Design a binder for these strands. Sequence first.
DNA 1: GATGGCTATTCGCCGTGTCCCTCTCGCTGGCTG
RNA 2: GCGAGAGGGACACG
DNA 3: CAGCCAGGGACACGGCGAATAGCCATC
Lengths: 142, 50, 106, 49, 1115, 99, 148
Amino acid sequence: GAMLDVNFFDELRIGLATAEDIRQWSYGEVKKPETINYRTLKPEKDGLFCEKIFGPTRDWECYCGKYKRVRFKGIICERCGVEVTRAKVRRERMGHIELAAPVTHIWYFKGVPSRLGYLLDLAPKDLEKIIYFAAYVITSVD
Amino acid sequence: PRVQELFEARVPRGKAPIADVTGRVRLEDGERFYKITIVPDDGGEEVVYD
Amino acid sequence: PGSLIDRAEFEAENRRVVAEGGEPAAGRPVLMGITKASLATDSWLSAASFQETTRVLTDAAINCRSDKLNGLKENVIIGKLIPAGTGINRYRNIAVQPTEEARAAA
Amino acid sequence: IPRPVKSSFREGLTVLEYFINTHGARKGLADTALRTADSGYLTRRLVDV
Amino acid sequence: SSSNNSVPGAPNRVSFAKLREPLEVPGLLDVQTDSFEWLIGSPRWRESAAERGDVNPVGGLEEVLYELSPIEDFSGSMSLSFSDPRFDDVKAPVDECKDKDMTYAAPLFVTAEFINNNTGEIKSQTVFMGDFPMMTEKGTFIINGTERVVVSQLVRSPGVYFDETIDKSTDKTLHSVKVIPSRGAWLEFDVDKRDTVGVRIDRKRRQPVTVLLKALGWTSEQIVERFGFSEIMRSTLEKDNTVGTDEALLDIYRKLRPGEPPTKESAQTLLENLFFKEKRYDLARVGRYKVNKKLGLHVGEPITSSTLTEEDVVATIEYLVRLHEGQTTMTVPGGVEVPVETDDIDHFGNRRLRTVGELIQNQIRVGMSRMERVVRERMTTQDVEAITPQTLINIRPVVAAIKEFFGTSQLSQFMDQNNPLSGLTHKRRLSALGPGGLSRERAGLEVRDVHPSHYGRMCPIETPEGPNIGLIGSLSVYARVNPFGFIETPYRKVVDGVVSDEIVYLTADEEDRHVVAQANSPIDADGRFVEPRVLVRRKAGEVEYVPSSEVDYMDVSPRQMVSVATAMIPFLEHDDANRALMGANMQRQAVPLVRSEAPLVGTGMELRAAIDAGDVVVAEESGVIEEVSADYITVMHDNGTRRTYRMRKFARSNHGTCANQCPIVDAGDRVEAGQVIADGPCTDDGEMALGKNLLVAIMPWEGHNYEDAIILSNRLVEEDVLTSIHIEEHEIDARDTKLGAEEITRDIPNISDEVLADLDERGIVRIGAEVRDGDILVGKVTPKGETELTPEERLLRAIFGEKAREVRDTSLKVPHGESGKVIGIRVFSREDEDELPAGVNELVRVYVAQKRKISDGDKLAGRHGNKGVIGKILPVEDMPFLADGTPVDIILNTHGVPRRMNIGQILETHLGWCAHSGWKVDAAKGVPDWAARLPDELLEAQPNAIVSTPVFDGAQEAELQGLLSCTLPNRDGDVLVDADGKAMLFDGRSGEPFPYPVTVGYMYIMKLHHLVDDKIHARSTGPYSMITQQPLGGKAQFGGQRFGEMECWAMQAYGAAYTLQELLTIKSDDTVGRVKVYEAIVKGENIPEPGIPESFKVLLKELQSLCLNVEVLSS
Amino acid sequence: VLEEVIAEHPVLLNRAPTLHRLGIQAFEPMLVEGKAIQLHPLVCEAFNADFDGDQMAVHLPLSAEAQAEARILMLSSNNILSPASGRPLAMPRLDMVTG
Amino acid sequence: KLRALKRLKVVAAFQQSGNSPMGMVLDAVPVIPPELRPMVQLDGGRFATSDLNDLYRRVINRNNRLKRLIDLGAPEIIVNNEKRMLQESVDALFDNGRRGRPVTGPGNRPLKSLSDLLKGKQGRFRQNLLGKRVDYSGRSVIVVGPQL
DNA sequence: GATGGCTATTCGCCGTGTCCCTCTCGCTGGCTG
RNA sequence: GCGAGAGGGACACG
DNA sequence: CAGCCAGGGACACGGCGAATAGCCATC
Ligand SMILES: [Mg+2]
Ligand SMILES: [Zn+2]
């Protein structure tokens, strides 16, 4: 539906988000545990604040500063890869972490009654043991 | 707290059972417990209490 | 069976299913507490903002429930005219123009 | 307290009678604060229901 | 003997007291000085302890070291020990430390002893042990420049406590215990619903006690032998279902340590170490005394073996079961018989007082435990015979613990000093909450009550009225702290019906063991009561009447129950507890005025409460005044030595008030030791003076004084009766920035030159310069940032080599609603070799003072809880005036008096008029009957004759009526106020008199620190929160008034949809809408339609961040 | 000029806790010397406000709809009876009743 | 029958809806934008704890360590322990302290997970959406105005 | 002897008023010249 | 321009 | 040693809802 979120709302739905949606939302992928450079105090590249992932900290200024003016808007620097635009886009553009292995959402597991357990007909204790690498499970026996 | 438990539809902490059928009553005054029975006029059953 | 549904919806569904085979659902009146009767409103946003945010939010997510945004607290969060008083469409859309006599008298 | 206090505030209470009065006074104040919190919660619940 | 005589320069404050005071009030700041001196080991503590227990003289640090040492390896090849805790002289004096942001501390030196065993040698040094903060002369620690007070805490003493819980589901009482140590493991010996008994170790899912009995090594036959009377214990024995001591040991091990392989030696070591090795289980000396007393095991044995013993445990079990049976008194083998009773965890015998010394000792013990961990760990790594204790001891954790206690702790409270009374009362305060104590949410509705054991140990009146009632209190006037921690109280022992003067101090236990009579009992001038029946306090707090044969103890005097703040309320026994509490709380809030007239009606507590508050400068040794000036008072002593007391003029207190001290002596006066040489903020010739006496009328005047509003006369503004100096402090620091350094200069980016007129050549403004909102106080600039020159400008500048010279002006400007003279500029620079935070080059303080007059809305309150803002300040001409023509300075509503039961303001009014106009009882025919008990030299009193009514023994109603009967005329033949205390008042406006007489007198009212200039606020646009774009909050920033949930409910109730949308959309969060609204109003166009709040977008993004696909359907 | 604009421009006065609907009411402002919001005595019972140190917050409606709502729905003279049981709340009390 | 009714309450919720339950297990974890988790800098060079960036740092570190462990080639015990630690890190990120000990922060302060920004009286719903600060407002002490 | 199957007991989870003013402090450890 | 802690003010006795 | 890196448990209550614990019944 709406992306500018004008007051022409009609309905607000909330549902289980799958990995496809997660990688759809993100404008990049954070992979390094870096936030800000020590000396120049600038958003670290590929970090939790990188401009490529979330947008520029300065209005119409890329990381290498190849463009600085309003005349360049909506285009991407070909060297630093930052999209020159208003800094406000740092408030909306999300990221995503590509986990090496699958993980379980706590709300659907531990929140009593365990919805995951009810779906799989598993008591919460055995479910915790299974998820927390305490013992094996038989997925399909031929 | 009475208002709070009344608007919350709680089971009252001081429940006083009310009957469910009319008619004469066989009283069984219980000591340390109690017992009442109301002779039903449908005669269905004197719903016992304890 | 054993679930609680609004009486209006219950009667509507009974009258809808009476045709195409007579098997209306059997129901009984219930008296439910206020905390429960406000955490089961048909608007996951009001329930989420009210109390027990985790439970109501997560079960609404599982049910993929949709808010209609026509309550009184739901329209205040999103910043819209409350459906009450001067906010209802009977008055929000009232059109006013000078009368013809006074308009000519201008 | 079955004593009880027997001096009017004009006549002036004694030390022990004043001490006995402090019980009820402080009890009233603390009760007032807790009851305010509870009634606030009840008002919120009613407004939301 | 009227007046407080044992103070040299006492103003002759005649008193109405009928009972002599056997015991003068103690050193009100002894509770803190004694404690910190105990921690230091100061000589006073040493010799006093020798006077009262010379067997065991040990200071706090000495005890900590002795408990800690020796420190030895597991192999046992060496050990380390400490001794000789020595304190050097303080590095800098008190005022210097306060000014220069320096903590007022002294170095600590402790000598080590590193003993070796494999070869044999002992190593000793003098080890620097951090800058231990040092208590000042009053009780306040100067920490990082500020002044802090470590409030004494109330804790439940470790020991044994038995309590009974009624089983509602079964109507069977269950008795249980809670053996609660210090720094140990809890454990319960309880009874379930059934006829069994449970044991919990560290609170582990109960267990039949038997597994423990056999575990300690007690056989079934011997268990039966020890419990050969209780049916319940033989029943349990039948139900033990466990044979073998080792079986119980391993079962308990598996229970406490699931998954750990149980074994015999491991269990034997563990179960013993849990409760019998002093390392991890040590109930302190107080705990051992409590256990011994409750079980009566050891009487003459000294305090040794603080840890538990199996005998104590079995004594606890047998006492528990005997109590369950219903026994009254019990006898233990090898121990005196003791009563069988349940213990209450609020009785002040079971509730001890961790004063300052014990708290700092606990923090030092924690730091030293960490240090011992570190030293023992590094012992292994370091090779033996090659290292020294100086190289072993790492002092960083200990100094860190000290710093994190004094700073940022819940008991190292910021000093609450705006008047001497507040500073005095913050000390002696007992805060029931803190580390190791219950918090507000955890605090119930029984711990906050007034237990009958509070009498004489904790004031029942004074306490905060917010969410702190009961938890925070204050010590009574006469109360003294026992060495163990309990709060003692003096008592006059009565022997053979004679009330001797042999004062003896009793704790709660001794108090309730014996029987105590009331303070105001009519002794026949020889120690024998008049009437047989006297009002007596019995054991369990009961009050009854007893013949004068069983009375065993008597209160030293009335006002033994009240604190210092409440003792200053005249006619307290006529006020109610609510309004007395309010008055006691408000006496700590008065701002110091400029004149500070003493009260006409007061108490003997003003003088002592003033000289003990500390600010009143007092001569330590007698002498003859040599020189006097505003800045110094130089006294010449009897023998050679001269001392120039340095006055403290215009010093900012912690809460912004003034701290002026003015001399009250001349060059020729001779002054005895302990005499008040100079006054403080709120002191008038020695005695406390928190406010002024104004003429008060008690009629409702034209509704301006409606519902607690007060109307003053313009005289109070003309003559500066109620005006106070308030000093505000502003701070700015120039610091090394990324681009360079920050400099403060008169040269500043574009601004009209007139503002530079007040600034001096080097930034900061000049002394004595008036400033207002928006004026510059410190001309400051910082590098603007990276900037771009115009390309032609840039090439020309490269040719020049010129600097950018950009900078951006950011100077200290006063907040909105501030103005006044500039007092002092205090400059700190690295060039002057001072201590500044790293990265800061310059740091300058500017003081700005303002003489705040009294204005509309400023809060005024008497002493009996008659608070009220100032509704209107009428001119002098239109004010009710007596026949003499004196206007009434203030008018109080009459409807607020009767329904609050605070009828002491009326009696204070009457006695104030009697004192102002004087009196003379007609002693022509003997004396009037009502004056029979009146002290001599009270039958006459000249005008402005200050008097005093002690708290619970003062002027009676009959005496007030009599004194109003004779109220000698002012100047002519005329009695303005007749015998009823009322007067004929002439209206100021209509001219005609009010048809009925009005109650007029003099009331001591005060100026509370709730002035309007500090309260008013207005915002139309200001800073915004970056996280959510709502406006900021508070008056410090601009901030906007919150529109909470309840206000929105009210708006919805009205049905005002558009106003609610306005308040929630474009006034707060519509980041794209606020600018449009500003422009529309400026240009006069129609308001634009609101958009969507930014906060809702934040909620949306967060829901999305929780893996909840929240999408918006347009249709 | 301030007076010129402030004439005929309502402002909402509120006192926390806003227990009931009358907690927030619209008053016609006027400039007054001093620094205290002079409040009409008869509305005190509506606000539960006594003058022993209370404080009140003032909000300014901006749009024509907001001003109309303040003038019509919420004006103090238009809110005399309580919304709970209909008993009056703007009546004289205390000093007025005694007089 | 009763346990069956509850299990139906769930499975039917999944059956009627067009969304599969596979969303419960997460291949990727979204990252809230940085401006909603800002790092304000306090004087002295010490950055105030935003309280989310540290949980994200923990998750990133554990994910990187797991990646390098699978690349290097490690036994089942170590890699499974790593997977458990990654589980716990994402766990604390989504809901701190819900299972096991909460992820403690500096000074024995438990951290604030994304859920704590909703749940509680200080969440967005209760604190920043129903009632919010407003511009064009002021306050002052009130006095009686009997002539008004 | 185990599944059904009813009543009781633990044990976690959720909640516990509004608005405002002031003040003070904000985690700990290693490589290396 | 956030968090924690402390203190404080205002809140029906028929 | 500091710039620049980085890595051991306490007084709260009341109510609701789910998972067991213990006891009688039947194949
Ligand atoms: Mg008030
Ligand atoms: Zn670029």
